Design a protein around this ligand. Structure first.
Ligand SMILES: [Cu+2]
Length: 75
């Protein structure tokens, strides 16, 4: 339920697998350094037009072994 806000650069988009690979900036809320992670698109994810290399602002939740995207857009 904790919504986590982050920023990063998009490294790959695979909608077939429902994955956006993001090299994210440190996330203080969860004590994460910069990482590269795949973030999962759900049917309810608020998607904007994004492409590889885009600087993005996004929100996610940790659920199961997945990082579920709430929203993502070019920052
Ligand atoms: Cu991470």
């Amino acid at each position: 339920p904790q919504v986590i806000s982050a920023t990063g650069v998009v490294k790959g988009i695979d909608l077939e697998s429902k994955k956006i690979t993001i090299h994210h900036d440190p996330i203080a809320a969860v004590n994460w350094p910069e990482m590269t992670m795949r973030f999962t698109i759900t049917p309810q994810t608020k998607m904007s037009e994004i492409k590889t290399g885009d600087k993005v602002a996004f929100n996610f939740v940790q659920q199961g072994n997945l990082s579920l995207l709430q929203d993502i857009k070019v920052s």
